[PDB]
RNA sequence: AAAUAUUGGCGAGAGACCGAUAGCGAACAAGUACAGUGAUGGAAAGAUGAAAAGAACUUUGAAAAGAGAGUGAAAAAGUACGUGAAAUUGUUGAAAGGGAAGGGCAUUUGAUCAGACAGGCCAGCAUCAGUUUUGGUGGCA
RNA sequence: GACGUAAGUCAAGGAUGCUGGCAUAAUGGUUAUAUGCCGCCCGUCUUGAAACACGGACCAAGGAGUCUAACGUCUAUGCGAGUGUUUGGGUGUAAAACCCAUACGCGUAAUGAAAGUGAACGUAGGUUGGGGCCUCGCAAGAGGUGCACAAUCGACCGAU
RNA sequence: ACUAAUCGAACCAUCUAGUAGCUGGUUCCUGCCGAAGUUUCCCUCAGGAUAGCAGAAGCUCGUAUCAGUUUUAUGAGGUA
RNA sequence: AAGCGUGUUACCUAUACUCUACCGUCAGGGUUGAUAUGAUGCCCUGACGAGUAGGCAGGCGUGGAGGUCAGUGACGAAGCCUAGACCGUAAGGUCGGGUCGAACGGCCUCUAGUGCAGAUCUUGGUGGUAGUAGCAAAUAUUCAAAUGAGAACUUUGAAG
C-alpha cells in the first residue's frame, strides 16, 4: 500500500527527508561490504567480530546426511507414545509389559538427558544415547536397545 | 446519496437558563439631581433647552416640564445621563406630579388630557419662577457653547 | 516565556488502549475499564493495563508454569489469571485441579486443564466471579526468552548473540573471536 | 429559524492565499506552505501574509454552521431529504448541483411539507 | 517420446494495464515523410453532424469573401469543424496612475451580495460580576 | 457563604432588567480604489543571500525514493512445541474459490577446528528487591506467598 | 597537420539507463516533538563508519532514584 | 540645547507580564441496575503552544478495484468560465449563473505510473523586444501604349 508510506508525506518538501547538506547520493561509502577492513572497521569489529580470517580445517565434499542425528531429550520421550495410549501406560507402570519406543521412526538419532521421566519402565530404541539419558531410563526401570 | 448522514444527530432540546443572581436595585441619582433644579437638555429635539426637573420616574427617567408656556417644552421624559444639572433651583412643593408615571407616557394630534395637565403643572411653576428675576428669560434662552468655553472648568 | 524544566506536550509513553481492532478484546477492555474505575481493587487496574500489551509483552504461559505457581503454599486454591495465551507442556506429567482464566487456551492446554478436573475460563467469567479479583494469581510468561533479545546490546565483551543468517565455521569465529586470530572480542 | 447559538466568530474571514500567487500566473491561490530556507513568509517577517494556524480554529459550538444557524446537508432526492425530518432546527438541506429541474420541484415541494429549510431553492427554477 | 524453454511465426482468450505529450517509434497512405556519401537516424499527425441534410437562392465585391436566406436538435457544430482552458490579443465597460507594480493590518468611498418579524440588525440607561485605570476623603502606627 | 428570630432574601460555583430606531444593503461579507504605518525575489548551496552568487521571459501538459530477492526492529493476525495448504495432487460455477498426502524449511540443544560429547544436589537452588493475591487489622500497618523483571552467588551441558 | 564543417585517435549502432565521495531538482495541508557541525578509526581532510545529539514505539513501576543548586564535613590542585 | 555631567518625577510602547475568551496538544479524572440508546462518546480540571535538517501523527485531493447508496443524469453527466454565495485553520468541499452534450458521484474498504514553480527540466504553444534591426556589393534607369480589378516590376515600342 503505497498510500501509507512517507513518500506520500514528503510531497511538497524539497529534500524528501534526506537532508539539504547530505544530499542523498549514489554510494557515499562504497557498494556492499566495501571497506570492511578500512573505513567500516569499527562497525564490523563491534557488531560482527570474527568476520575476517580463517579458522578450522576444511571438508571437501561435505554431505550433511552423514551428520544426521536429531536429538530428543528425555522429558519429551513420552510424546512418542500416542496421546490416547500414553495415559494407560503411565497407569500400570509394568515391567512385563512396557512400551517400546522406536525413536528412529520418529526421526531422531540420539537421545539426550534433560531428564525427569516418570518411574515407568520403557523399552527405548535408538541409534545413540548419552550416558545420563540411559541411566535415567534404567533408573525408571526401563532399558535402552541399540538399533541401526 | 450526496452525503450519507450525520452518524448521530444533535438533540434539538433547548436548555433552560441557569438561575441568574442579578437583582434589580433602585437607581441612585447624582446628588446634583433634585427636583426643582434647572436642567440643560444635552441631546434631542430640545437640545440646549433649560427645563425644570420635577420627578424621578420608576423607569430611571426624569420627568421634566421646562414650562411649556415659557420655552415650549411639554411634560416629557429625559435621560438623567443626557442632562446637565445646573445649580439654579425653583420650589416644587406646589405642583402635583403623582399622576405622571410610565403608563402616562405610554404611546398606545395632541390629546386633550396632556394639554390640560400642562396648564395645571406650569400654573404653579411659572408663579414661583416670577419670584426671583430673570428665570423666565433664562428658561426661554437656549444653552450653547461659545468660543473659549471649556466645560471641564465651567460651572452650571 | 517559560523556562521549561520538562519537555512540553510529552505523551505518557504507555498504551491507553489495545492496538488491535479485535472487537471482542475491545469490549473486554470496556468491561475492565469500568471495573478499574468503579472498584478500588488493584487487580482490576493491573488486568486492564495487561489487555493493552502487544504480542511480545504478553508471552505464552505454560501449564507447567501454572502448575508450579500452584505449588506455593496456600496458593493451590487460587484462580490463575493469564492475560494472554496459555499453552500446553508435555514435560509436566501430573497437573492439579485448578481454575485458569485466560484470553486464549491452545487445544492442548484446554484439554490438560479440563482432564485434570479443572475449568478453563475467559476474563469476563472471571470478572463475574471475582469482581475485585478475590484470591487470584496473575502469571506472566518469560519476556526475555524471546529470540530477538539475544541480540540486544551487542558489543565487545558484552556476551550477546551476533545478528547472523548462517551459523557455523567460517561464520564470525575468527579475527576478533580468538586470541590466535588478532584479538578476542 | 434554527436553534439559538452564540454569535458566530470566524477569527479569520480573509482567504489564505499562497505567497506570490498574485505575482505569477503559474502559482495558483490554493494554499501552500513556504518551505524555502530564506522565505520571509516562512520566517514570519513583519508585513507579510499570514499562514493557517490551529489558533484560527472556530469555536466548536458555532463550527460548520451557516449564518442561518443550520448545518448544511447536501441532498440528492426526496429520500435523502427525509433524514432531516426531525432535525429541521439543526440542518438545512442543499440540493445537489446535478439534480434535474423537474426533480428539484419535487424536493422543494416535499421540503415545505416538512419544514426543512432549503439553502438553494432558486436553482434551475423556471420563471 | 513425455514432463522443460519460447520478447519469432500462426490462431485464440483475457487484464484492478495505457488512453493520442499516454500506450510500441508508429490508433492515421509509419519504419512513412524527411536528414545523412554511408552505416544509420526518424517524426508530427485521431474526434463536424444521427444523417452532408456540406449552406439552393438574393445582394455587395475583380475575387477571396461579407450580409441575408436556408439545413440542422444545435452553425455557441461551416470540413480553419466535439468540448474549447492558459499564456498572449482586440473591443466594450469600470477604475487607478508625480522614477516600477504587486502585498499585510485597519477603515472611508463606490460597486455588488447572502439571510430574517411566525425575535433578525444597530444602539441607550440602570443594577451587578470579572479585570483594570484615574480621582476625593476618613481612621491609625 | 452572608443578612434576617424565622420565612426567606442576596452583589454568595460567570448578565440581567427596562427602552428606542431599523427590519434593509442599514450592520456585515466580497471586491476595486484611497489613506496611515509596515512589506527587498523566489528556489538553492552556504557561517552568512535582496545580493554585483546560481536557475527562472510566459503558459499548458508531462516530470523524480519505485518494484523485487534477502533481512533487522516494532506492530496486527492465526495457530502454538509447533508452525507453514497453493512444488505437486484433488476439485471447480475455471488463472478464482474449496480440499489434501509425503516431504521439506524454520523452531524444539548446545558446544568444539575436529574426532566428539551433550544440559535437575535441591520444591529446577540461595540472597536482595519486586506488582498482584491471601491473613489479621476502622485504618496506618504487620505477616505469608511472591509471576515478569533486575542484581548477585551457586548448580548443570560443551570447550580448555 | 589531414582523414566528408568531426582529429593529441573519425563516424555509426550496441554494451549502456556505464560509474560519479560532485552539481542541479526532488510535487498536498495541518498538529506535536526537534538537532548537528563534536569523539575515535579510515589512501582519511567535498566522503564514510563510530559515539553523541533527535524522533517514534513503548515497557516495569507510582514519588522513589534523584539534581548543570546550595549547606555542613572531609580531600585533591600549583593557576592569579 | 533639542549638547555634556548628574538628579527627581510624569509619560510612550513588544508576539514579554497579569486577567478573560476561543483553537489545539499534553496530562489527571468523571460518566452503565435506559450510561436519558454513539464509552475511539459526552463531560470536568490544570498546564502548555518558536523552529531549519529531521521524525511521527491526523487529515485533503487524483487514476483505477470490491461493496453499498434499488445514488445523479439528454427535463442535461463530465469538462470549462464566473473581483456571485456558503462550509473548513488548511489541503479542499459545496451551491448559483453561463457554455456544453453522455456519462458521473457520496460513503466503507482495496490499489497505485497518485498532487509541481523551479531541475540552462521535456514537448508544444505564446509574448515584450517590435512594426524594431534591417530588406545599402555586382554603374541604371526613363517615356508611352497594351493587358488587367489593380502595373515601379508583365508585354510591345522608344530611349539611355
Ligand atoms: Mg538537495
Ligand atoms: Mg474561510
Ligand atoms: Mg483559505
Ligand atoms: Mg537561513
Ligand atoms: Mg505516441
Ligand atoms: Mg480535436
Ligand atoms: Mg449545443
Ligand atoms: Mg461555445
Ligand atoms: Mg458544437
Ligand atoms: Mg470547436
Ligand atoms: Mg486569457
Ligand atoms: Mg496599500
Ligand atoms: Mg465593575
Ligand atoms: Mg466596502
Ligand atoms: Mg519599508
Ligand atoms: Mg562562502
Ligand atoms: Mg535567497
Ligand atoms: Mg558568476
Ligand atoms: Mg553552482
Ligand atoms: Mg537567466
Ligand atoms: Mg501537472
Ligand atoms: Mg562445563
Ligand atoms: Mg574535417
Ligand atoms: Mg549516462
Ligand atoms: Mg519545541
Ligand atoms: Mg591504509
Ligand atoms: Mg558542496
Ligand atoms: Mg532524544
Ligand atoms: Mg607554579
Ligand atoms: Mg602547569
Ligand atoms: Mg540632562
Ligand atoms: Mg510549534
Ligand atoms: Mg520541515
Ligand atoms: Mg436516475
Ligand atoms: Mg452541466
Ligand atoms: Mg478570473
Ligand atoms: Mg454525442
Ligand atoms: Mg509520477
Ligand atoms: Mg510548470
Ligand atoms: Mg519547489
Ligand atoms: Mg525553462
Ligand atoms: Mg527601419
Swiss-Prot record, chain A:
GO molecular function, one term: structural constituent of ribosome
Basic residues: compositionally biased ranges: 1-13, 20-29
Record-level GO cellular component terms: cytoplasm; cytosol; cytosolic large ribosomal subunit; nucleus
Pfam family, one: Ribosomal_L27A
GO biological process entries: cytoplasmic translation
Domain of life: Eukaryota
Chain positions of motif Nuclear localization signal: 6-12, 23-29
InterPro entries listed in its UniProt record: Ribosomal_uL15, Ribosomal_uL15/eL18, Ribosomal_uL15/eL18_sf, Ribosomal_uL15_CS
Keywords on record: Cytoplasm, Isopeptide bond, Ribonucleoprotein, Ribosomal protein, Ubl conjugation
Subcellular location: Cytoplasm
Major localisation: cytoplasm
Family listed: Belongs to the universal ribosomal protein uL15 family.
Subunit relationships: Component of the large ribosomal subunit (LSU). Mature yeast ribosomes consist of a small (40S) and a large (60S) subunit. The 40S small subunit contains 1 molecule of ribosomal RNA (18S rRNA) and 33 different proteins (encoded by 57 genes). The large 60S subunit contains 3 rRNA molecules (25S, 5.8S and 5S rRNA) and 46 different proteins (encoded by 81 genes).
Function: Component of the ribosome, a large ribonucleoprotein complex responsible for the synthesis of proteins in the cell. The small ribosomal subunit (SSU) binds messenger RNAs (mRNAs) and translates the encoded message by selecting cognate aminoacyl-transfer RNA (tRNA) molecules. The large subunit (LSU) contains the ribosomal catalytic site termed the peptidyl transferase center (PTC), which catalyzes the formation of peptide bonds, thereby polymerizing the amino acids delivered by tRNAs into a polypeptide chain.
Protein name (Swiss-Prot/TrEMBL): Large ribosomal subunit protein uL15
Species name: Saccharomyces cerevisiae (strain ATCC 204508 / S288c) (Baker's yeast)
Name of the gene encoding the protein in the UniProt record: RPL28
Swiss-Prot record, chain B:
Swiss-Prot/TrEMBL GO biological process terms: cytoplasmic translation; ribosomal large subunit assembly
Gene Ontology MF annotations: RNA binding; structural constituent of ribosome
GO cellular component, one term: cytosolic large ribosomal subunit
Pfam families given in the database record: Ribosomal_L6e
Keywords (A to Z) from UniProt: Acetylation, Cytoplasm, Isopeptide bond, Phosphoprotein, Ribonucleoprotein, Ribosomal protein, Ubl conjugation
Residues modified to N-acetylserine: 1
Gene3D superfamilies documented for this protein: 2.30.30.30
Chain segments annotated as coiled-coil in the UniProt record: none
UniProt modification remark: N-terminally acetylated by acetyltransferase NatA.
Subcellular location, record wording: Cytoplasm
InterPro entries for this protein: 60S_ribosomal_eL6, Rib_uL2_dom2, Ribosomal_eL6_CS, Ribosomal_eL6_KOW, Translation_prot_SH3-like_sf
Positions bearing Phosphoserine: 11
Role according to the record: Component of the ribosome, a large ribonucleoprotein complex responsible for the synthesis of proteins in the cell. The small ribosomal subunit (SSU) binds messenger RNAs (mRNAs) and translates the encoded message by selecting cognate aminoacyl-transfer RNA (tRNA) molecules. The large subunit (LSU) contains the ribosomal catalytic site termed the peptidyl transferase center (PTC), which catalyzes the formation of peptide bonds, thereby polymerizing the amino acids delivered by tRNAs into a polypeptide chain.
Subunit details: Component of the large ribosomal subunit (LSU). Mature yeast ribosomes consist of a small (40S) and a large (60S) subunit. The 40S small subunit contains 1 molecule of ribosomal RNA (18S rRNA) and 33 different proteins (encoded by 57 genes). The large 60S subunit contains 3 rRNA molecules (25S, 5.8S and 5S rRNA) and 46 different proteins (encoded by 81 genes).
Family, per entry: Belongs to the eukaryotic ribosomal protein eL6 family.
Misc note: Present with 37100 molecules/cell in log phase SD medium.
Full protein name: Large ribosomal subunit protein eL6A
Curated annotation (Swiss-Prot), chain C:
Gene label: RPL18A
PANTHER family hit by this protein: 60S RIBOSOMAL PROTEIN L18, LARGE RIBOSOMAL SUBUNIT PROTEIN EL18
GO cellular component: cytosol; cytosolic large ribosomal subunit
Assembly: Component of the large ribosomal subunit (LSU). Mature yeast ribosomes consist of a small (40S) and a large (60S) subunit. The 40S small subunit contains 1 molecule of ribosomal RNA (18S rRNA) and 33 different proteins (encoded by 57 genes). The large 60S subunit contains 3 rRNA molecules (25S, 5.8S and 5S rRNA) and 46 different proteins (encoded by 81 genes). eL18 interacts with NAP1.
Entry similarity comment: Belongs to the eukaryotic ribosomal protein eL18 family.
Entry keyword set: Cytoplasm, Isopeptide bond, Methylation, Ribonucleoprotein, Ribosomal protein, Ubl conjugation
Annotated protein name in UniProt: Large ribosomal subunit protein eL18A
Further comment: There are 2 genes for eL18 in yeast.
N6,N6,N6-trimethyllysine found at: 49
Amino acid at each position: 500500500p503505497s498510500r501509507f508510506t512517507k513518500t506520500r508525506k514528503h510531497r511538497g518538501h524539497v529534500s524528501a527527508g534526506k537532508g539539504r547538506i547530505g544530499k542523498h547520493r549514489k554510494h557515499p561509502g562504497g557498494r556492499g561490504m566495501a571497506g570492511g577492513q578500512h573505513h567500516h572497521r569499527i562497525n564490523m569489529d563491534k557488531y560482527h567480530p570474527g568476520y575476517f580470517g580463517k579458522v578450522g580445517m576444511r571438508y571437501f565434499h561435505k554431505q550433511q546426511a552423514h551428520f544426521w542425528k536429531p536429538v530428543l531429550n528425555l522429558d519429551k520421550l513420552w510424546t512418542l507414545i500416542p496421546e490416547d495410549k500414553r495415559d494407560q501406560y503411565l497407569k500400570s507402570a509394568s515391567k512385563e509389559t512396557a512400551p517400546v519406543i522406536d525413536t528412529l521412526a520418529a526421526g531422531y538419532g540420539k537421545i539426550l538427558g534433560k531428564g525427569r521421566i516418570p518411574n515407568v519402565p520403557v523399552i527405548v530404541k535408538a541409534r545413540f544415547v548419552s550416558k545420563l539419558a540411559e541411566e535415567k531410563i534404567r533408573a525408571a526401570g526401563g532399558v535402552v536397545e541399540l538399533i541401526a | 446519496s450526496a452525503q450519507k448522514a450525520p452518524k448521530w444527530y444533535p438533540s434539538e432540546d433547548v436548555a433552560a437558563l441557569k438561575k441568574t443572581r442579578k437583582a434589580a436595585r433602585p437607581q441612585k441619582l447624582r446628588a446634583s439631581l433634585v427636583p426643582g433644579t434647572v436642567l440643560i437638555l444635552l441631546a434631542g429635539r430640545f437640545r440646549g433647552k433649560r427645563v425644570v426637573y420635577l420627578k424621578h420616574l420608576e423607569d430611571n427617567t426624569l420627568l421634566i416640564s421646562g414650562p411649556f408656556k415659557v420655552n415650549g417644552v411639554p411634560l416629557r421624559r429625559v435621560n438623567a445621563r443626557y442632562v446637565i444639572a445646573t445649580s439654579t433651583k425653583v420650589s416644587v412643593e406646589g405642583v402635583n406630579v403623582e399622576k405622571f408615571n410610565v403608563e402616562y407616557f405610554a404611546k398606545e394630534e395632541i390629546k386633550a388630557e396632556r394639554v390640560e395637565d400642562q396648564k395645571v403643572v406650569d400654573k404653579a411653576l411659572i408663579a414661583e419662577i416670577k419670584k426671583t428675576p430673570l428665570l423666565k428669560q433664562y428658561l426661554s434662552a437656549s444653552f450653547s457653547l461659545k468660543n473659549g468655553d471649556k466645560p471641564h472648568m465651567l460651572k452650571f | 516565556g517559560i523556562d521549561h524544566t520538562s519537555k512540553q506536550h510529552k505523551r505518557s509513553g504507555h498504551r491507553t488502549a489495545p492496538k488491535s481492532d479485535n472487537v471482542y478484546l475491545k469490549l473486554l477492555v470496556k468491561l475492565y475499564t469500568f471495573l478499574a474505575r468503579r472498584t478500588d481493587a488493584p487487580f482490576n487496574k493491573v488486568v486492564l493495563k495487561a489487555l493493552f500489551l502487544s504480542k511480545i509483552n504478553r508471552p505464552p504461559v505454560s501449564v507447567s508454569r501454572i502448575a508450579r505457581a500452584l505449588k506455593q503454599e496456600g496458593a493451590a486454591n487460587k484462580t490463575v489469571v493469564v492475560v494472554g495465551t496459555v499453552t500446553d507442556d508435555a514435560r509436566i506429567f501430573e497437573f492439579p485441579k485448578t481454575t485458569v482464566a485466560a484470553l486464549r487456551f491452545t487445544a492442548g492446554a484446554r484439554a490438560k486443564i479440563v482432564k485434570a478436573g479443572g475449568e478453563c475460563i475467559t476474563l469476563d467469567q472471571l470478572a463475574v466471579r471475582a469482581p475485585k479479583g478475590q484470591n487470584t494469581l496473575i502469571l506472566r510468561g518469560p519476556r526475555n526468552s524471546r529470540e530477538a533479545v539475544r541480540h540486544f546490546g551487542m558489543g565487545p565483551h558484552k556476551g550477546k548473540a551476533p545478528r547472523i543468517l548462517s551459523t557455523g565455521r567460517k561464520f564470525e569465529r575468527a579475527r576478533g573471536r580468538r586470541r590466535s586470530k588478532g584479538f578476542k572480542v | 429559524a434554527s436553534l439559538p447559538h452564540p454569535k458566530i466568530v470566524k477569527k479569520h474571514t480573509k482567504k489564505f492565499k499562497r505567497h506570490h500567487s498574485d505575482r505569477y500566473h503559474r502559482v495558483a491561490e490554493n494554499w501552500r506552505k513556504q518551505k524555502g530556507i530564506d522565505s520571509v513568509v516562512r520566517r514570519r517577517f513583519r508585513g507579510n501574509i499570514s499562514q493557517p494556524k490551529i489558533g484560527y480554529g472556530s469555536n466548536k459550538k458555532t463550527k460548520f454552521l451557516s449564518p442561518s444557524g443550520h448545518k448544511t446537508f447536501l441532498v440528492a432526492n426526496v429520500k435523502d431529504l427525509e433524514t432531516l425530518t426531525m432535525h429541521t432546527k439543526t440542518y438545512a438541506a442543499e440540493i445537489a448541483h446535478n439534480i434535474s429541474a423537474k426533480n428539484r420541484v419535487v424536493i422543494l415541494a416535499r421540503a415545505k411539507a416538512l419544514g426543512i429549510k432549503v439553502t438553494n431553492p432558486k436553482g434551475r427554477l423556471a420563471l
